[PDB]
Design a protein around this ligand. Sequence first.
Ligand SMILES: CCOc1ccc(NC(=O)c2cnccn2)cc1
Length: 149
Amino acid sequence: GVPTYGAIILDETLENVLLVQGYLAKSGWGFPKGKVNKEEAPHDCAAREVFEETGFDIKDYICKDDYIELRINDQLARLYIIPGIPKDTKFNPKTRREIRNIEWFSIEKLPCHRNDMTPKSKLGLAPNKFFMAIPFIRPLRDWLSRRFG
Ligand SMILES: CCOc1ccc(NC(=O)c2cnccn2)cc1
């Protein structure tokens, strides 16, 4: 699988994260990210994808060692952590054929797992519009505890 790179952008209070909503197979909410080009460095892919999806340039704010990385079904996703970005920042995608909306969400209200269907004696998980964000939520809360407390 081709690796993906992007960012977890937080506000000045560290309460809120910025999520993007795509279309079709990406119809729900997730962190801004995308696939690396041949010979493109990880930091440069993360800035490129975030700027295309939000209109905000992270290049001068990336810290090389501050990121969460997860391997999901063979494919690696790395999100650089970017705190302190003001909540009144104007965000606008470049690609509106790809991005429906951009919003701030409270970290403590986001799910860190989907709900089962054990009230119905049925297997699997119920739909959740935060599907793409969910795998990063617990590791994020643990990272913010260690770094800031
Ligand atoms: C990808 C299209 O957007 C949606 C919209 C709704 C849901 N399904 C839910 O059951 C739901 C209900 N309430 C809270 C959270 N999720 C999943 C994806």
